[PDB]
Amino acid sequence: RNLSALKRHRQSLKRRLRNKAKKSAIKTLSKKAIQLAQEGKAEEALKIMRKAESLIDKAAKGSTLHKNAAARRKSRLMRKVRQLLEAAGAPLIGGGLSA
Amino acid sequence: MVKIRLARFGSKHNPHYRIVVTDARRKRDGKYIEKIGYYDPRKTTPDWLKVDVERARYWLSVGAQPTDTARRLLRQAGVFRQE
Amino acid sequence: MLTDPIADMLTRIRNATRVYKESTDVPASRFKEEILRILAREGFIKGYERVDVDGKPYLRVYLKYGPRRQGPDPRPEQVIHHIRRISKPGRRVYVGVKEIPRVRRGLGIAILSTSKGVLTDREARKLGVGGELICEVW
Amino acid sequence: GRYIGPVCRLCRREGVKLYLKGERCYSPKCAMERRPYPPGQHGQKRARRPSDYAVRLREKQKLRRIYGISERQFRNLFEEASKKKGVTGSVFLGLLESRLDNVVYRLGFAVSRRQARQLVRHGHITVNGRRVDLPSYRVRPGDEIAVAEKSRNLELIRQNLEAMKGRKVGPWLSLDVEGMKGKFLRLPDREDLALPVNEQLVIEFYSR
């Protein structure tokens, strides 16, 4: 028995737990940003989009997200924010959107 | 990683290889990418090694790492000479 | 209404010769005329001319036979021993130049219709084309 | 194995002299020489009209029973002859005439074909220098069939290559008696051979 590959498993678990955590924030902030936008709170709705952006690319740094997966997220996010701010918004900090 | 190695084609005790380009992960005698030569280790004929420096040089120029033996054979056929 | 006019002509000819008629009429058509043009050149018929039967355009096909023979049944040998329709409505038959057949080790002919016109297997092969294998004749 | 056994009996069944003994088959004793009726308790009774089949069967036997080849090898050769270009019957005969054991016979190094065969399997023969012990070895044109020095001094080889002095040999061949060596000049042309076999019938035995 005993085939030291259980190691690969051990590691997978640590990695799993690391990815899991990273994605979780990305979601939380994304939602959060989407929420403030759908409320007209432009200055900070962007403020947070900026963080979400960072966290996404950052996740894509290693193998948590990686790929065009990162890009989709960034896309869909800016997509929903700029659009929701179509309620008088008027991008302030433009902390991410290029108007 | 594509390679330039030998492929077994003779018969029991009558080995005959084929210098060949292929993806490192394929069976040694499997689907190769291109044959770029042949080689008879027992030199049963005055023609026991042929290459095609032109093609060898193409693949080399695009990755293709050769086996030590293949590298050897390629060299012997003037693949790397520059003089 | 005729179903396959070329087959009709092929048959009218076949029949008429079995009773050794001098000539025999067939409703006219460019296409039928074109085939006749070959039957004549290849020397299977003494030739043909356009007549006007009862007001309509027909084609006298003058038939040809061998000479009177010895013993019983002195009927001449037929010049046209065989004439078969091949391609037919409801089973058209085409061939590439490479697929044009050779009728009786050459002793006969096959008439095919090509975009270079109605040719014999010799002519077809020469012009290097193929087409709808119309009929066989020997 | 290759038959081994009463041979001047095959001669009798085939009703013709097959030379499977060289000498004696010339003396007043080949049996075909006085006692021409087939072997066995029935050979003298009047024969019944043979079926076309019987003819070809007997005809194929005659031809094969001459070179001492096994039906197996005989068949394979004929198949090779068929597939090859040129008139099969011809090609077949030539191919048989190309067996080394046979050449060794045509050249006289040996009395009969069986004897010849043994001289080959026993290494007394050489081809272009290197010795060859394969009775079925096919000789190409230009090859030098010979005796190996180590064998040139054997009583049998002597009597044999001696009796060959002055004796002429097949036109598709050539022999240098003193050098105990000969050459396979050309595939014997059908006309060169004078076998008591109508090979057309053999081609037919294998068509059925």
Add this chain to the structure above:
Amino acid sequence: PKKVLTGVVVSDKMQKTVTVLVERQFPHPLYGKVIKRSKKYLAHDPEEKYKLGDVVEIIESRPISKRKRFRVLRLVESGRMDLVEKYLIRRQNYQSLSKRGGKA
């Protein structure tokens, strides 16, 4: 090259989607007789531009959905239910040739 096919539009009943009946011809692999088979393609009509009876070209395209991988390249000839009819009648014939019998 993205495949291009021609056919008649035999169904409008879908949003931004038309059913194009494409007829095909060819020699029977063993009997020679030139036979005629056909197949319906659900092509993408974004601006619901094409209607029943429209002979249209169909172009091989990126999946727009399931069962839908062609867009209408263009309009060949308009109006001509003679075709839609053949089709419709053939479908209606199926009518009851089951336990009873269709309609002739």
Add this chain to the structure above:
Amino acid sequence: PTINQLVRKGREKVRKKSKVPALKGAPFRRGVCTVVRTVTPKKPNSALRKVAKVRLTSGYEVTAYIPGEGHNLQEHSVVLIRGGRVKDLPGVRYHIVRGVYDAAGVKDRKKSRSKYGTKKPKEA
């Protein structure tokens, strides 16, 4: 038929019916004799043929002939079947290979020995 009809129905390929449900399309099937006994020929023959009802391993129960001048089979004899019908005994479609299992070979058999499974006598 017309070509169009052939295009529509085509020719029906010939199905081949086995004459030896020795199942598995095996060359031989083994079983055990349920019964052993004589049987009368048909058409114009007359005799007391030796047969056998065999409980087959192929899950079958069939009757098999016992070729030879004489045998040694009983209600519990293991046997190997080969398949070969006896033209005279309708119902018998298989033979029992002799020399295999409880089926001894044919004693004092001098000729067609390979059949009837009998070793070459030490004649001399």
Add this chain to the structure above:
RNA sequence: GGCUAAUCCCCCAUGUGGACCCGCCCCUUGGGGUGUGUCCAAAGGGCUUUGCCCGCUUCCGGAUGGGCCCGCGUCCCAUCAGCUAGUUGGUGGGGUAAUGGCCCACCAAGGCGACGACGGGUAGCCGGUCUGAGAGGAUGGCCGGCCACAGGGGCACUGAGACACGGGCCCCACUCCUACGGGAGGCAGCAGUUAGGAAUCUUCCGCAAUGGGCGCAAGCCUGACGGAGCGACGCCGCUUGGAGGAAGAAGCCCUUCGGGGUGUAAACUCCUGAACCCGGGACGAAACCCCCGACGAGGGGACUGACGGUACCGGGGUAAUAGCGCCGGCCAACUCCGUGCCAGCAGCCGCGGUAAUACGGAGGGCGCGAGCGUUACCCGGAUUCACUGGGCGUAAAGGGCGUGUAGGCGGCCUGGGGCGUCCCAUGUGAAAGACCACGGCUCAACCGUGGGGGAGCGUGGGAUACGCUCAGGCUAGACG
């Protein structure tokens, strides 16, 4: 619970560059460019220690591998005819590397079918293999490509890549351990066991060679592989002897009792000499590495074989396995005796009821020969599912008749298009196999190299007689 290193994780920075939103430009499905805004990098180690090696980060591209989609093709039953709700489509969203009812919410009511839907049966597909004159039939084992599966079912995690045979989780069945709470397993890897079966091998040698993973390298790992073992299972090669030898031994067989046969066969003489023995003894192996040269080119040097003491070479040397089927016709080979519709033979026709070339035996004969027969199965012959290539008055076969739907088929002349059809060029058609030639092993089987053909399909160009389509015309079909 506590301590701790890093090429482990994180934050800030630099922004070649790249990602995302918006605009504009070129392109045209999400391709390429550009402007502002935002966001995003890194790891060190070794030294022949100021340089070089291994390596790290971001981006563009190459190469190889791959996902997804599409046209066409792919077995049997219609005694399966109707099927369908994520079901067909739409808008938005989720999801992924990516398109998509893939998934979801919402709306529409669609989608499929006799050109055979749906259901049932069977089955991995192919290059090819076998057969066949061909068309075709049958087949898919070895080898090569693709697919699928890893005790049965489901699931996701980690990763460039898996939904992962020798990773993980859960349920099920079974086995094992059990202090009864709970645990451990998964040979469809090599070999081997057992069970099933008519039937299918060694718990072998080696990592030397080719190939693979990791390592700068030495080198480690490799039941992949290279070899040996067992089985006539197949193919090919070889032997059991060669020459002489009586008008003819003996024995056995037949007999018109003269003789005939086995038979030159044996005996016997002479010759060669498979086995066996002695000696020698291999290619497959020259790279990696080290030295010189710049760790390059190039040159120099060293190590290394399981098979194997095997192949092969030389010397010596013994006459030294033959069997199986068949002999009524088809079908090549005949007589005696025994038996007496018995015992038995038998592929079909048939043979045996006191003369049996058909049963059993014997002599003899034919066939083939380390085989020969048998059984099973595939193609053939079988133009006996007929496309090539059949039929239907009485042989099997015209529907009891009509009307008519779909469909199949379509008179003469002209013109347009050029779908079918035909032509040229080009791409594709892997290797192996098959064919041809030459070559390596003494031959061959086996293998190496080279050559040639090739349907189908894609692309570009062309032809227009026939079929098709469109347009016009006609009157011989048809109808009035």
Add this chain to the structure above:
RNA sequence: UACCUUGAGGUGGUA
């Protein structure tokens, strides 16, 4: 099992 009778059998007859 035997003879009658069959070419040989079945039946049938005679022990």
Add this chain to the structure above:
RNA sequence: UUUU
């Protein structure tokens, strides 16, 4: 009467 069965079989020739």
